[PDB]
Design a protein around this ligand. Structure first.
Ligand code: NFU
Ligand code: SF4
Ligand code: SF4
Ligand code: SF4
Ligand code: FES
Ligand SMILES: [Fe+3]
Lengths: 138, 297, 447
């Protein structure tokens, strides 16, 4: 009767390739996520995640290179500092920290991406729908 | 030229800034025909055929909603007058609580309040809307004058342009342009984050580089940057530039990016979130209702 | 039959008057309703205490200085810091300048239209534009007074509307010798215009007396105002309360306000109904601002104002309960505040550099109090060890005049209205004139 709406932000060099690897190996995972491509996770900022929640996202996922393996040397270090602040801001706004998930997944980590998608889906399914859009539409 | 004004969920400060035109107010009033303005005249109903309308404040109750819709039908051009009307303003912080919590405090739990039956006013008073909303969220807004309140010259410039038939144009840059504080040519780098009362700030150096949360980087210019000039950080009362939707989100993005940039790979990403105990109040003082997430669930 | 005056015009904020009639057509109920509330007391919870002087001015665009300073004082008490003398003088100079702007604004732009045209059918004439057309000198003087007041606020506060210099431990910036010299030279003209304003008031109130409108909304009550050793003071001192006969009931420090003041709630208004705790809802009614401050004071703090006060006391006695004479008391204060701007600018300590004291250990409780142009203003904040607000209470000026306004409109209707036909546009405006006598700030009052 209800399925979570999850949005994803993946870097073109590692997590995007990691998601492609999962696909080449037919590594099945739940169909709630919709991925958006960026060149680096350093492109990800609070405005894109908060905009996703405003639009109705039940969960937001972000994927970047391993710390130290960014294709652009240090874009993921800036995103890491931004996401830690964002986790606590979401809690101040009544949004469960668990509705945001950020992971470091390489282009060769298809199995890890599959399990991260399964775990995040199960986590959001258990939390139920985020009632922000419903509260704003009143 | 028939002009009208009204106020909604604001504080009257935008109307007072209009009066701060002083001698120029009389020159303005001789050119325009003021047909409705509760603070200055007794015309009770908004008349038909209004050419320009200045609407102060955001939407806080059902009456504000009706008036906004009525002014929209009677006026050709509608202007969101001030930061409250444009972004929601300080009253927007009420969105961090339920209406029942705001009302129970004011009419029951305040230390001096004596309410025997425990009732909330409900007779001949309007109900509050679910959350404070900027004017554009309920009606079509043609233009807007940002500022808490907007400087008197900017108000005259916008109105004067509309009387001439020209399209009004607001300044586009961020506050560091107008701010007289000296910046490091190497770039901005933040070592630690301090609250406004911690330490003694240097009067020449950029307050953001000193470790204070200054909203000037994420705020539109026009005010003349009187706050940093006076010794305190900008609070972002003019709102964001035209290229930024969520001011707080962008301010957080900038602050997090430069925090410990000289030691980027080793700086602890938990120092900043741990050092800021009031995040919404630090980044959304005047714009929470216009943010992507404008309420606390 | 049910009549409604909405919105009440030439007042700050959202208010309305309802007039109902019984089946026989006789006057039944007359009430004053305040139709707005924002909830500042609750949303301040969770905010940094040092940010209170940034949020509270947004309660009102007219008396934003009073809130900034009341908040700054409460914050100074939370940190347990005593500000340097220069900071006290700068805060008071800002406060006096703001009073000149507020009193001039109300008397000329909101009150004078009725005092000049109390029996007109022409609604489009009853406003500052109508006064300017036949008496431009009067509106030019009003503008010059407001401009002087706002200039002092802009220079000392950083901004004319929503000042920012009152910080933890004192001021964020000092007044430079060149700025002090410029303001002091301009200060003499403000005092002259204020003296001129009192005379305009005498004439206009004489015109009101001729139409038998000087006693509209009359009723007797207690009066509250701040006094410094019995002397009229809008910035520092103790809160004094006198009964309807002028006997001092009590004198207390603003930090103990919760033991003397109570705020009742009625279902027809978002504006509360305060009263003196010991006396009750009816016997404990009191008023605040201008006339109430003159009534509780032994004397004024400035010489020119003291002369008009002496002449007024000999003519109407002490205490004066006339709502319409709040207009006259307002002009005496306008002059006293103009005189104080000059007096504070002449004090060499105003240009001092020791403007701030380092914040001391945090104490989760602080009360800030000043006499806002519309009455006693109290900002009470409670915080945790980190200085994050946990609870707040604001007793904001005009709320204390809500009972007087509700009683007053009823008394005006009792005097002029017997049947629905009697409620003519002029008579309905007489009810609004009573409201206007108190210079209500409804956004302020409900906060
Ligand atoms: N004067 C004044 Fe305010 Ni607009 C009121 N009433 C505040 O304390
Ligand atoms: S924008 Fe600022 S000055 Fe204008 S109504 Fe809102 S709080 Fe008042
Ligand atoms: S103090 Fe604020 S406005 Fe001035 S340069 Fe620094 S960041 Fe910009
Ligand atoms: S410096 Fe910032 S907070 Fe101060 S008036 Fe300008 S925009 Fe507003
Ligand atoms: S490219 Fe993958 S995070 Fe920088
Ligand atoms: Fe209150």
């Amino acid at each position: 009767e209800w399925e979570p709406k999850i949005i994803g932000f993946c870097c073109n060099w590692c997590t995007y390739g990691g998601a492609d690897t999962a696909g080449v190996g037919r590594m099945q995972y739940p169909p709630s996520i919709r991925i958006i491509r960026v060149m680096c996770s350093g492109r990800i900022e609070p405005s894109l995640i908060l905009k996703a929640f405003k639009e109705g996202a039940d969960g937001v996922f972000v994927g970047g290179c391993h710390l130290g393996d960014c294709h652009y040397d240090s874009g993921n270090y800036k995103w890491q500092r931004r996401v830690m602040m964002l986790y606590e801001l979401l809690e101040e706004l009544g949004i469960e920290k668990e509705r945001l998930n950020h992971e470091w997944i390489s282009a060769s980590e298809g199995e890890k991406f599959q399990n991260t998608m399964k775990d995040f889906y199960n986590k959001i399914e258990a939390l139920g729908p985020c009632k922000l859009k419903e509260e704003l539409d009143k | 030229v028939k002009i009208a004004t009204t106020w909604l969920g604001g504080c009257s400060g935008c109307h007072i800034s209009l009066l701060d035109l002083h001698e120029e107010l009389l020159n303005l009033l001789e050119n325009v025909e003021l047909v409705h303005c509760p603070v200055l005249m007794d015309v009770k109903e908004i008349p038909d055929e209004v050419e320009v309308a200045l609407i102060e404040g955001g939407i806080r109750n059902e009456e504000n909603l009706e008036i906004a819709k009525e002014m929209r039908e009677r006026a050709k051009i509608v202007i969101a007058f001030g930061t409250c009307a444009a972004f929601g303003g300080v009253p927007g912080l009420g969105n961090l609580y339920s209406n029942d919590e705001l009302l129970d405090k004011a009419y029951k739990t305040t230390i001096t309040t004596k309410n025997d039956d425990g009732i909330i006013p409900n007779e001949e008073v309007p109900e509050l809307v679910s959350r404070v909303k900027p004017l554009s969220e309920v009606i079509e807004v043609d233009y807007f004058i940002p500022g808490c309140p907007p400087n008197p010259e900017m108000i005259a410039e916008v109105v004067k342009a509309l009387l001439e038939g020209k399209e009004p144009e607001l300044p586009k840059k961020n506050l560091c342009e107008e701010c007289a504080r000296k910046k490091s040519e190497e770039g901005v780098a933040i070592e630690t984050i301090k609250r406004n009362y911690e330490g003694n700030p240097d009067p020449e150096k950029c307050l953001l580089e000193q470790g204070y949360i200054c909203l000037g980087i994420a705020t539109r210019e026009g005010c003349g940057a009187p706050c940093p000039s006076s010794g305190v950080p900008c609070s972002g009362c003019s709102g964001p530039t035209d290229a930024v939707v969520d001011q707080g989100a962008k301010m957080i993005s900038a602050l997090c990016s430069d925090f410990g940039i000289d030691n980027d790979r080793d700086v602890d990403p938990m120092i900043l979130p741990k050092s800021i105990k009031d995040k919404i109040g630090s980044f959304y003082k005047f714009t929470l209702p216009s943010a992507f997430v404008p309420i606390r669930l | 039959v049910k009549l409604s005056v909405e919105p009440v015009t030439r007042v700050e904020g959202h208010g309305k008057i309802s007039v109902s009639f019984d089946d026989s057509g006789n006057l039944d109920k007359v009430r004053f309703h305040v139709v707005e509330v924002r909830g500042f007391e609750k949303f301040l919870e969770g905010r940094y205490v040092e940010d209170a002087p940034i949020y509270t001015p947004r309660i009102c665009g007219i008396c934003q200085v009073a809130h900034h300073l009341a908040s700054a004082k409460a914050v100074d008490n939370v940190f347990g810091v005593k500000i340097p003398e220069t900071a006290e003088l700068l805060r008071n100079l800002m406060h006096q300048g703001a009073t000149v702007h507020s009193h001039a604004l109300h008397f000329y732009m909101l009150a004078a239209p009725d005092l000049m045209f109390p029996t007109t059918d022409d609604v489009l004439k009853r406003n500052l534009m109508g006064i300017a057309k036949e008496h431009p000198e009067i509106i030019k003087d009003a503008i010059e007074l407001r401009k002087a007041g706002q200039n002092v606020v802009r220079v000392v506060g950083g901004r004319a509307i929503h000042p920012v210099t009152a910080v933890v431990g004192g001021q964020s910036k000092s007044l430079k010798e060149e700025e002090r010299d410029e303001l002091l030279k301009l200060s003499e003209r403000t005092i002259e215009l204020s003296e001129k304003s009192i005379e305009v008031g005498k004439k206009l109130l004489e015109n009101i007396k001729d139409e038998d409108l000087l006693d509209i909304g009359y009723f007797e009550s207690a009066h509250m105002g701040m006094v410094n050793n019995g002397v009229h003071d809008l910035y520092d001192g103790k809160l004094r309360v006198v009964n309807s006969e002028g006997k001092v009931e009590y004198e207390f420090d603003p930090s103990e306000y919760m033991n003397y003041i109570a705020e009742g709630v009625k279902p027809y208004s978002y504006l509360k109904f305060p009263y003196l705790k010991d006396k009750g809802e009816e016997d404990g009614i009191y008023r605040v601002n201008t006339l109430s401050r003159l009534n509780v004071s032994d004397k004024m703090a400035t010489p020119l104002a003291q002369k008009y006060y002496d002449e007024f006391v000999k003519e109407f006695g002490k205490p004066c309960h006339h709502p319409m004479l709040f207009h006259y008391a307002r002009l005496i204060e306008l002059l006293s505040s103009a005189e104080m701007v000059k007096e504070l600018l002449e004090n060499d300590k105003i240009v001092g550099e020791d403007i701030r004291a380092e914040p001391e250990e945090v104490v989760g409780d602080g009360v800030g109090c000043v006499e806002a142009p519309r009455g006693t203003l109290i900002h009470h904040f409670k915080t945790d060890d980190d200085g994050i607000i946990t609870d707040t209470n604001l007793v904001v000026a005009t709320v204390q005049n809500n009972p007087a306004m509700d009683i007053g409109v009823r008394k005006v209707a009792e005097k002029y209205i017997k049947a629905p036909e009697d409620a003519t546009p002029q008579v309905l405006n007489y009810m609004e004139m009573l409201i206007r006598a108190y210079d209500p700030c409804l956004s302020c009052a409900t906060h």
